[PDB]
Design a protein around this ligand. Structure first.
Ligand SMILES: Nc1ncnc2c1ncn2[C@@H]1O[C@H](COP(=O)(O)OP(=O)(O)OP(=O)(O)O)[C@@H](O)[C@H]1O
Ligand SMILES: Nc1ncnc2c1ncn2[C@@H]1O[C@H](COP(=O)(O)OP(=O)(O)OP(=O)(O)O)[C@@H](O)[C@H]1O
Ligand SMILES: Nc1ncnc2c1ncn2[C@@H]1O[C@H](COP(=O)(O)OP(=O)(O)OP(=O)(O)O)[C@@H](O)[C@H]1O
Ligand SMILES: [Mg+2]
Ligand SMILES: [Mg+2]
Ligand SMILES: [Mg+2]
Lengths: 43, 359, 47, 289, 67, 96, 342
């Protein structure tokens, strides 16, 4: 489920810059955010 | 005055006949203006209708909410009746009066100040609340041990200060039928908006104040709907215009935390057990109407009445009066107050050791 | 889906009765209702 | 107000209508007990009559004293010592409405029905003032309030708080005395035990030594007793016998006398009944003393 | 030769609060309607719990029916 | 030539029209209330709370508060008092 | 056109069975199968409409402007709430999430379709009581250009059986007409509780209300650009049927703030509007890290202002801010009253 979350967050990140395509570095941003949330909510 | 009074009786009988000719009309609520002669009116029965209006009713004063009268046969709007007051609201605001004033309350002087800074100050000085910038408080949750003045304070507030008081019992809102446990609260809060300022005062709210269950029964689920309805009409998608809510209970622990949040229930004035000098005021107040027959130095009673709570001191006065009667004496004696104090103090052990936490 | 079997996903008797909107004393009420629509698969989750 | 079916004209007003259960609970025939049938209670009788009856016939003395008459008297005690019989005698002697009320009768089906019933009870009491309500077995609704998130009895607490608000609060009317005869005073909520609400807490103790003789004498009137029964000996024979445990002794003695064919009871039948009722309900087996 | 109304202890335990009290009240009214009746309250171990407090208000409905 | 009696037993005579034309058979049941000194207040379960007089078929002293009245359907009247309502679940607990 | 007299009963069209017959549900409570008048614009007989019915026949005779039967009304200007995004201090991530799940989907759906993501059609603002769940939505309504139909949860339930699902469908129809629009069903935990009693009329009506809500929300196609927002204090007491894709998926998690930066931001936001003295430091107030909520840290400043007013000072000082912390936040009790546990 985190993979789907990563993909959806990357799609949202592409929107945030008002862009048209999803990039690899936006994927990096999304995976970083998903990891941070997953490791935080484990508390 | 035979002929004249007989004519008066004739006028009464004629009025009875005129009433006999008259007919009733249903009451509904206008919710739309489809055209100049087509309105969508609700009915107290429940069904909606498409009703044609008369020719004399001013069409301008027909918006969502105005009560109107409907002819029973053809369902035609007749009158422009003003807003409604639910009978279970007049039966609440029409309490007797109360003869006790702020003098009758003893010991409680700091908490009286704290309560009055929210009940009287916003209603009579809304300018310091502006330049300072404070948001005017709404709720005052009086709480303390059972029998210290949490209700007598409300009676004093009703008699003193002013504003349209609405005394509210806890269970006096809950009805068997679905939703009526919340419609009553809705009309209670609607009446206040048309009678500003209002000092709506619930009481014993730990009936509908309980921590909402997660696996309660059907009964405890309909009450939670009432708690939601009450909760929203304090901080919901609307501002309480000029309504102050006073709220009293004996067990603040069993109160829903959403209701206890600072912002819905503001400054939580706590009424504690009377302490020494406070108890002397209670003894002086409650033993002033009684026919005192001595140098009533209540210092011994003050020392012995440890942990006594308000009404208990009145019970010592009552028991002293009883003891005076036991010897047929017509006025209490300073050594008969002592017996009553001892007797009440012995019974005080029957009560549970009153414990409570400062919220 | 590919085997073409109706996929029931009961997750609690109270939720089943609430969703179907009918009273029931024990959970086998889903069994008679599922026998009519066969083949079928009952999927129960966990936490 | 009565109103016509079709014209909806107000034909005539009507008296206030309470719940039909409230009309039934009003006592109609006065139970014939009198204070002469209750024995062993002298302090308790004097305390109750001087707290619930006296401020109803000669309230002018209290008004001259400028003192508030007590609301009601609690009647806690061990089971079977007269907590209910005293109420029967009080209803016999009094000259005011004596609405009886069993506490479980208050607890009802739907949300708020119990509160409505217990409010209508006090409304009816105020209507036919003065009154003496007799909420009985108060521990049925007077259980302590408690915090709980799992589940609770939040329905009965509604009736409890409604009763509290009717006893004291904005409405008093100060002319409706409320008696209550619980059995477990250790369970009652602290609010219900407060002053302003039930003030007098009359303790009903187990009968004294002479009290037992008085009880035996009272409950052996109808039966055909003999002229040689030593009531003092019987009273001493019973030790910590609580009230109805003596009426049971009388009944058992009569039953034994009837079984043995005697036309009238004797001291021996009374002693046999004492052994029958007592913790010797097993009896038999005189082995090893 | 008299009516012999039988009562199993578990039958006096309904779901909704206060229904056991109505159960017993209606039962006793029916018994009083007849000239001579015998009631056989059986397995009163069910509704027989001694009054006790535990903070959580344990099985207080059965206690209500019993009182 | 599932819901009937027994044709071989007959006993389903066609004289039921005689006990059928008497439209007094439909009688609203309702528990009486406060006895206004004579007018009676009737509390039809959920249709109304009518105030009604007698129906000449019952003695005025036969109706008391708490009794169930066979109220007439049209132009309501107190026709026939009925035995007090008993819960069905308390009925089979009677050994016959 | 004579049956269109002016006694009439408002009904709700449910299903077109034939060209000249339909299944309407009159407000009296019970459904009918009626004959449709052969003059109405049959292209307007959308499901859950607000058609009118003849009095004693129930034959469909007139279709109404579908924004007429609504008992709930679109929030206009007299009820326009008076809070701002600037006034709502803190909640930066929550603000961004609600903006990207509520406002942006309303404005630009083409970007969502082109990117490939699924536009959210429901948010479930939840958290501990006193965290701004209501206020953030309140600030949204003060800046949105879309209709803000505001229903209030328990307002759905009424004695009149059938006044539930009917008004639910009516509210959703009103939302669909004034698109774009935001529904703000509030305190939904009173309608969507998990446990259920299939014997009493209380639960069997809330059940129909929830079923109608769920069906209408599932009926949301890719278009109609109407978003649903509901807030609750207890997330656990919620039907899991409300937490599925196509229904409420995005879940905002309003936390009881513990970060120093968040408390600093919100304290400064509240202080800016008020009359803090120049020699008054909020940093001295926020030295200790508690579980302070977003609401208590405003009532504390209200209490400080009241304390200053009591001493006749018309500008609050540091000595009153210090005392305010001691009276509005003492303990949560728990075990901190017993030091030996740690
Ligand atoms: N400060 C006081 N001075 C004099 N009498 C007092 C005082 N406080 C309480 N009383 C007495 O208390 C009685 C009124 O009820 P009281 O205020 O004790 O109830 P409460 O604590 O509000 O009740 P509840 O437990 O139902 O919330 C009166 O008899 C009044 O004399
Ligand atoms: N002092 C007494 N004089 C005469 N009879 C007495 C006395 N005390 C008890 N009894 C007998 O007790 C029986 C009734 O007991 P009672 O109802 O008062 O007990 P209780 O414990 O208060 O009951 P409950 O708690 O169920 O209300 C009667 O048969 C009565 O004769
Ligand atoms: N970020 C914030 N900045 C300033 N004040 C805030 C903030 N969040 C909440 N508040 C305070 O919260 C109060 C309004 O209640 P709020 O909207 O926070 O309730 P809520 O958390 O939505 O409650 P509930 O769950 O009961 O509906 C106001 O007094 C306001 O000062
Ligand atoms: Mg009080
Ligand atoms: Mg008794
Ligand atoms: Mg809120």
């Amino acid at each position: 489920a985190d993979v789907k979350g990563v993909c959806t967050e990357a799609g949202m990140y592409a929107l945030r810059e008002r862009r048209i395509h999803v990039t690899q570095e936006d994927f990096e941003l999304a995976v970083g955010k998903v990891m941070n949330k997953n490791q935080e909510t484990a508390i | 005055q035979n002929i004249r009074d007989l004519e008066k009786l004739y006028d009464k009988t004629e009025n009875d006949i005129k009433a006999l000719q008259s007919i009733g009309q249903l009451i509904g609520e206008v919710m739309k203006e489809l055209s100049e002669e087509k309105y969508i009116v609700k009915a107290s029965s429940g069904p909606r209708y498409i009703v044609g209006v008369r020719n004399s009713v001013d069409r301008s004063k027909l918006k969502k909410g105005v009560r109107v009268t409907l002819d029973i046969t053809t369902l035609t709007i007749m009158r422009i009746l003003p807003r409604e007051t639910d009978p279970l609201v007049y039966n609440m605001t029409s309490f007797e009066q109360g003869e006790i004033t702020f003098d009758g309350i003893g010991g409680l002087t700091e908490q009286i100040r704290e309560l009055r800074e929210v009940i009287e100050l916003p209603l009579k000085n809304p300018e310091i609340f502006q330049r300072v910038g404070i948001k005017p408080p709404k709720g005052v949750l009086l709480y303390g041990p059972p029998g210290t003045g949490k209700t007598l304070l409300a009676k004093a507030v009703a008699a003193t200060i002013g504003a349209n008081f609405i005394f509210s019992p806890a269970s006096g809102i809950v009805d068997k039928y679905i939703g009526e446990s919340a419609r009553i609260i809705r009309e209670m809060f609607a009446y206040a908006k048309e009678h500003e300022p209002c000092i709506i005062f619930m009481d014993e709210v730990d009936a509908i104040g309980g921590r909402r269950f997660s696996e309660g029964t059907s009964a405890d689920r309909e009450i939670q709907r009432t708690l939601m309805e009450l909760l929203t009409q304090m901080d919901g998608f609307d501002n309480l215009g000029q309504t102050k809510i006073i709220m009293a209970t004996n067990r603040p622990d069993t109160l829903d935390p959403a209701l206890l949040r600072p912002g819905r229930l503001d400054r939580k004035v706590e009424i504690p057990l009377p302490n020494e000098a406070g108890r002397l005021e209670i003894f002086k107040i409650h033993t002033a109407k009684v026919k005192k027959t001595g140098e009533f130095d209540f210092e011994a009673a003050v020392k012995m009445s440890d942990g006594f709570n308000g009404a208990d001191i009145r019970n010592c006065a009552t028991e002293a009066g009883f003891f005076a009667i036991r010897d047929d004496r017509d006025h209490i004696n300073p050594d008969d107050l002592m017996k009553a104090v001892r007797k009440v103090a012995e019974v005080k052990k029957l009560e549970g050791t009153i414990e409570y936490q400062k919220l | 889906h590919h085997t073409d079997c109706k996929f029931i996903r009961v997750s609690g008797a109270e939720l089943v009765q609430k969703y179907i909107g009918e009273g029931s004393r024990m959970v086998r009420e889903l069994f008679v209702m599922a026998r009519e629509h066969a083949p079928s698969i009952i999927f129960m989750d966990e936490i | 107000v009565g109103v016509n079916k079709d014209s909806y004209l107000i034909l005539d007003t009507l008296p206030s209508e309470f719940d039909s259960r409230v009309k039934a609970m009003e006592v109609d025939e006065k139970p014939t007990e009198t204070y002469s049938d209750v024995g062993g209670l002298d302090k308790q009788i004097e305390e109750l009559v001087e707290a619930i009856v006296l401020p109803m016939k000669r309230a002018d003395k209290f008004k001259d004293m400028g003192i508030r008459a007590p609301k009601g008297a609690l009647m806690y005690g061990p089971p079977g010592t007269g907590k209910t019989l005293l109420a029967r005698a009080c209803a016999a002697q009094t000259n005011a409405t004596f609405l009886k009320l069993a506490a479980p009768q208050l607890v009802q089906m739907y949300i708020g029905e119990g509160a409505k019933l217990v409010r209508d009870a006090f409304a009816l009491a105020k209507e036919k003032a003065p009154t003496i309500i007799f909420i009985d077995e108060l521990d049925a609704i007077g259980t302590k309030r408690f915090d709980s998130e799992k589940s609770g009895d939040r329905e009965v607490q509604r009736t409890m708080l409604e009763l509290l608000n009717q006893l004291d609060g904005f409405s008093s009317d100060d002319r409706v005395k409320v008696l209550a005869a619980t059995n477990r005073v250790d369970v009652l909520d602290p609010a219900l035990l407060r002053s302003g609400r039930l003030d007098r807490k009359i303790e009903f103790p187990l009968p004294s030594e002479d009290s037992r003789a008085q009880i035996l004498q009272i409950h052996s009137r109808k039966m055909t007793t003999d002229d040689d029964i030593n009531w003092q000996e019987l009273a001493r024979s019973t030790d910590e016998f609580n009230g109805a445990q003596l009426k049971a002794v009388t009944v058992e003695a009569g039953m034994i006398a009837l079984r043995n064919g005697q036309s009238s009871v004797k001291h021996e039948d009374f002693v046999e009944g004492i052994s029958e009722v007592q913790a010797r309900k097993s009896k038999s087996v005189s082995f090893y003393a | 030769d008299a009516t012999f109304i039988r009562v199993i202890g578990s039958e006096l335990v309904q779901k909704y609060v206060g229904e056991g009290a109505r159960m017993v009240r209606e039962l006793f009214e029916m018994a009083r309607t007849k000239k001579a009746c015998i009631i056989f309250f059986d397995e009163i171990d069910a509704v027989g719990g001694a009054r006790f407090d535990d903070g959580a208000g344990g099985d207080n409905e059965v206690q209500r029916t019993m009182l | 030539g599932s819901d009937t009696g027994l044709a071989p037993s007959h006993l389903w005579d066609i004289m039921g029209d005689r006990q059928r034309l008497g439209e007094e058979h439909p009688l609203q049941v309702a528990r009486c209330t406060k006895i206004i000194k004579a007018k009676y207040v009737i509390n039809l379960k959920q249709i109304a709370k009518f105030v009604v007089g007698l129906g000449e078929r019952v003695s005025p002293t036969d109706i008391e508060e708490g009794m169930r009245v066979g109220v007439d359907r049209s132009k309501y009247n107190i026709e026939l008092p009925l035995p007090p309502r008993i819960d069905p679940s308390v009925t089979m607990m009677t050994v016959e | 056109k004579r049956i269109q007299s002016v006694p009439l009963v408002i009904g709700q069209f449910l299903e077109p069975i034939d060209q000249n017959t339909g299944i309407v549900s009159s407000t009296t409570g019970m459904s009918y199968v009626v004959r449709i008048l052969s003059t109405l614009d049959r292209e307007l007989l959308k499901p859950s409409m607000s058609v009118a019915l003849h009095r004693h026949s129930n034959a469909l005779v007139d279709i109404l402007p579908p924004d007429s039967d609504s008992s709930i009304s679109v929030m206009g200007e007299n009820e326009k709430p008076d809070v701002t995004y600037a006034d709502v201090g803190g909640l930066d991530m929550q603000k961004q999430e609600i903006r990207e799940a509520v406002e942006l989907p309303l404005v630009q759906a083409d970007l969502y379709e082109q990117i490939g993501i699924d536009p959210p059609r429901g948010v479930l603002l939840y958290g501990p009581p006193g965290t701004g769940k209501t206020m953030l939505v309140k600030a949204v309504a003060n800046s949105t250009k879309a209709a803000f139909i505001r229903v209030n949860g328990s307002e759905f339930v009424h004695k009149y059986l059938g006044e539930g699902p009917r008004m639910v469908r009516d509210v959703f129809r009103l939302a669909r007409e004034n698109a774009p629009s935001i529904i703000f069903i509030d305190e939904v935990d009173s309608i969507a509780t998990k446990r259920f009693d299939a014997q009493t009329g209380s639960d069997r009506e809330v059940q129909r209300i929830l079923i109608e809500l769920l069906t209408q929300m599932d009926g949301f196609d890719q278009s109609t650009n109407v978003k649903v927002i509901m807030a609750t204090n207890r997330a656990d007491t919620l039907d899991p049927a409300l937490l599925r894709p196509g229904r409420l998926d995005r879940k905002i998690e309003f936390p009881s703030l513990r970060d120093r930066r968040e408390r600093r931001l919100i304290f400064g936001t509240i202080a800016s509007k008020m009359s803090l003295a120049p020699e008054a430091d909020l940093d001295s107030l926020i030295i200790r890290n508690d579980s302070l909520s977003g609401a208590v840290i405003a009532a504390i400043m209200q209490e400080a202002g009241l304390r200053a007013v009591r001493k006749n000072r018309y500008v609050i000082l540091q000595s009153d801010l210090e005392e305010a912390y001691a009276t509005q936040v003492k303990t949560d009790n728990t075990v901190d009253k017993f030091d030996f546990y740690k």
